[PDB]
Write a protein that holds these residues in place. Structure first.
Motif: not given
Ligand SMILES: [K+]
Ligand SMILES: [K+]
Ligand SMILES: [Mg+2]
Ligand SMILES: [Mg+2]
Ligand SMILES: [Mg+2]
Ligand SMILES: [Mg+2]
Ligand code: NA
Lengths: 66, 100, 243, 151
Positions: C52-67
């Motif tokens: 499989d191939i997984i590709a996502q756009i992610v933004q970092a945060k203190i509580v945890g990364d947000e997709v």
RNA sequence: GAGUACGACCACACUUGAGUGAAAACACCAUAUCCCGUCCGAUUUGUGAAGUUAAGCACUCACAGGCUCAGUUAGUACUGAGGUCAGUGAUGACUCGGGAACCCUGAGUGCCGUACUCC
RNA sequence: CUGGGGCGGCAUAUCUGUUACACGACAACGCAGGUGUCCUAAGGCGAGCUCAGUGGGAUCUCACGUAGAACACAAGCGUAAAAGCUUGCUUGAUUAACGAUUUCCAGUACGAAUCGAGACUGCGAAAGCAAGGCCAGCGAUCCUUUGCG
RNA sequence: CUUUAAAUGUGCAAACAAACCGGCCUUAGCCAAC
């Protein structure tokens, strides 16, 4: 012929007290800070001065007319 | 079936020590060590075997063998350790050598 | 391993113990200018599993990364791919689909269409360092960055979709280190699957003289000359209906 | 014996037991504005942009922000007066300060009380002091005395 | 109830042994013409699905050793203030206050987010 | 300078640990040691590895191995997919409008160091990192001499 | 030498040039944009 002591120094320092620090709103210069923000701040201040002059002129005219 | 003990690598070293290493793997290495087995008459001393499972016996030979699936240790991403039961033992290696 | 050994022992982070994260790289990846006061900053995560191939756009945060968006290679059957799902063409399709989905979500679609077709050429990315395009950076994780890898295929897919990921064409397949040039024709061949087609044709030429490779491809009537049209149709469908 | 920059810091600049390591990601993601109150605590594992050993426990206000640096104003008594020193450090050696927490809580509580009064809800009953007296009914009574076994 | 990808805190999560693991995932795994790299397709890179849960992984279990939180130690050790106190002195007690640690014994053995998916 | 002076030595500029008493400051011809150099790589960056040591086997091979090694030199602090080792490309050891600041401090300079703005660049797919080798290794007026305009 | 760790210490804050709550004006300053 060389002696060192800190005996009377605290008393001498507290005779005319330890003066407290100057309030933070005084001597609040911005020299040496980040230049990109400094320049934009200068432009905004110029616009504000022009606005103040216009506001005073409007006040004077209103008072004279009425 | 995954517990099938198979030969992994065979290294032959000649130590002249005067003013050489080589490792061979795959179906070629199985063709080799037949000359060594013939020269040793399929008979070697018991103390030559090592606790890990490897053994060896001019050119000095050394064969390291073990079950498949040991990639979980030499892998780069998510490397871990192979189970002790899945690791090969000296007695099992000796039994395999006698069988083959 | 006495008792004192356990008494003085600092364990590493959990995701370093499991060997999933490179924190030295992650720090410099999420680091931003302090004179920005936490403006949004996105990274593009490309992870390739066994099948499989997984590709996502992610933004970092203190509580945890947000997709923000996520694309998978196993959603390509809905568009017309059922054979590869792992090769370079699958990577390109996944990147293009992810980029289209993200632009559709932000509503900035119909303004940045990238390239309507594929040529394998290199065109510089427009960045602040005419309205600017969406921008993200590429995180390859622990993968090794060699010329002609699939992560850069995903990157090329996203760039052709319309996102602005800064890059240089030093890792695309048709690149010669000595000549210091790129071969857009070789790149297009690898995007559309000429290598897969040639290997399948050679395997079909063999495996008949003697009576696992390409078992399902051969079981289906996948002729080695029905590949480029399939991929073009897949691209057109993806751009037509990203959702 | 020598007036070096880092003289006598063997215990001051040293990591705690089983807490070694480079900064985390929350430190990197923390946001500092001009006018905030910060604590200056050195991190031994960075070694770039450290403050002098005098400023290791002080609290100050931020006057300047750069790409990877902060400017803090800190008081320092020199003889008969107090100076306002301006130091430049990296962002890893500062930490947001909770020194105005109680004051902000007081302001919020007063605003909530004002809102409740304007709305018309019933306020909670006021607390009762513990310095008053009353009848004490004891469950257990004992005798306090020195016994022979005590020594 | 689970799985995967990205994570915050960074042992209640570690180290050492057994047992179990539906579906889907994740793995081992097959292979080397083309991109790519090696003494070695071992590691890495490309192209695929014949075999499995053996191994990784997850859960349960175990006086385990460690780690975390309580209780005893103990108003003990030490300590701020006081005396035309005691004693030859080392030192000690008293008056107004603050107040531990090692050890030993109980309990416990991760928690919290975003997205997609299977029951 | 000097537990008189002389002889001896230097702490006479300068760094670490200690003396030193849980912020900072703190003396002795106090204690134990250092410094006036060395490096076009021993500087910059990317990648790949894991050291000191122990056990089994014939320099090689396997398992363990929280740093017990190594970072030019004294010592302290720091560091494990690194700041150590190997390797590929390089010259950020350049220039930098009289920007601001810390240490000594009289809040004077000198030496050293920290946060920056501009140019031209190096390494890297990228985010990024680098204006030497973190922290000791250096020098006024007058005069001579070179470059620029 | 060392985790554990006092008593005495030491920095900052505690509403009138401050801060709070919703319009508007200006700036490129940041962000794909606001
Ligand atoms: K004197
Ligand atoms: K492999
Ligand atoms: Mg002190
Ligand atoms: Mg590295
Ligand atoms: Mg220097
Ligand atoms: Mg040095
Ligand atoms: Na100046």
């Amino acid at each position: 012929s060389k002696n060192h002591t800190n005996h009377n120094q605290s008393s001498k320092n507290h005779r005319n007290g330890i003066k407290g620090p100057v309030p933070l709103h005084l001597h609040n210069s911005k020299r040496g800070s980040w230049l990109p923000a400094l320049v934009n701040a200068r432009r905004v201040r110029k616009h504000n001065q022009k606005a103040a002059l216009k506001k005073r002129r409007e006040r004077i005219a209103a008072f004279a007319a009425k | 079936p995954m517990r099938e003990i198979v030969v992994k690598k065979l290294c032959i070293n000649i130590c002249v020590g005067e003013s050489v290493h080589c490792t061979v793997r795959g179906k070629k290495a199985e063709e080799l060590l037949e000359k060594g087995l013939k020269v040793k008459e399929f008979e070697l001393k018991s103390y030559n075997f090592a606790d890990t499972g490897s053994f060896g016996f001019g050119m000095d030979f050394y064969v390291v063998l073990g079950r498949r699936g040991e990639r979980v240790a030499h892998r780069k991403r998510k490397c871990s350790r192979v189970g002790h039961s899945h690791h090969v033992t000296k007695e099992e290696a000796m039994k395999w050598f006698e069988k083959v | 391993k006495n008792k004192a050994y356990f008494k003085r022992f600092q364990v590493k982070y959990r995701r370093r113990r499991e060997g999933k994260t490179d924190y030295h790289a992650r720090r410099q990846m999420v680091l931003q200018d302090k004179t920005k006061f936490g403006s949004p900053k996105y990274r593009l995560v490309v992870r390739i599993t066994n099948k499989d191939i997984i590709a996502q756009i992610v933004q970092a945060k203190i509580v945890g990364d947000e997709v923000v968006m996520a694309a998978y290679a196993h959603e390509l059957p809905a568009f017309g791919i059922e054979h590869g799902l792992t090769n370079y063409a699958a990577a390109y399709a996944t990147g293009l689909l992810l980029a289209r989905r993200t632009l559709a979500k932000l509503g900035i679609a119909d303004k940045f269409q990238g390239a309507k077709e594929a040529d394998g050429s290199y065109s510089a990315v427009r960045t602040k360092k005419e309205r600017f395009p969406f921008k993200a950076i590429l995180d390859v994780g622990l993968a090794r960055t060699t010329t002609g890898a699939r992560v850069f295929g995903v990157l090329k897919g996203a760039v052709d979709g319309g996102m602005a990921v800064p890059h240089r064409p030093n890792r695309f397949p048709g690149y010669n280190k000595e000549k210091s040039s790129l071969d857009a024709k070789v790149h297009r061949d690898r995007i559309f699957g000429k290598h897969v087609a040639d290997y399948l044709k050679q395997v079909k030429e063999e495996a008949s003289s003697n009576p696992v490779q390409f078992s399902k491809y051969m079981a289906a009537k996948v002729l080695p000359e029905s590949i480029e049209g399939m991929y073009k149709k897949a691209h057109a469908a993806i751009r037509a209906d990203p959702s | 014996h020598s007036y070096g920059y880092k003289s006598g810091t063997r215990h001051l600049f040293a990591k705690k037991f089983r807490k070694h390591g480079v900064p985390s990601v929350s430190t990197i993601l923390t946001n500092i504005k001009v006018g905030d109150y910060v604590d200056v605590v050195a991190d031994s594992a960075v070694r770039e942009g450290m403050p002098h050993k005098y400023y290791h426990g002080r609290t100050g206000i931020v006057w300047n922000v750069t790409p990877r640096g902060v400017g803090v104003i800190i008081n320092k008594p020199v003889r008969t007066r107090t100076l306002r020193k301006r130091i430049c450090v990296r962002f890893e050696h500062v930490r947001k300060s909770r020194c105005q927490e109680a004051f902000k809580a007081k302001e919020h509580q007063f605003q909530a009380y004002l809102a409740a009064k304007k709305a018309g809800k019933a306020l909670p009953p006021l607390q009762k002091s513990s310095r008053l007296g009353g009848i004490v009914r004891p469950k257990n009574v004992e005798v306090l005395a020195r016994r022979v076994a005590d020594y």
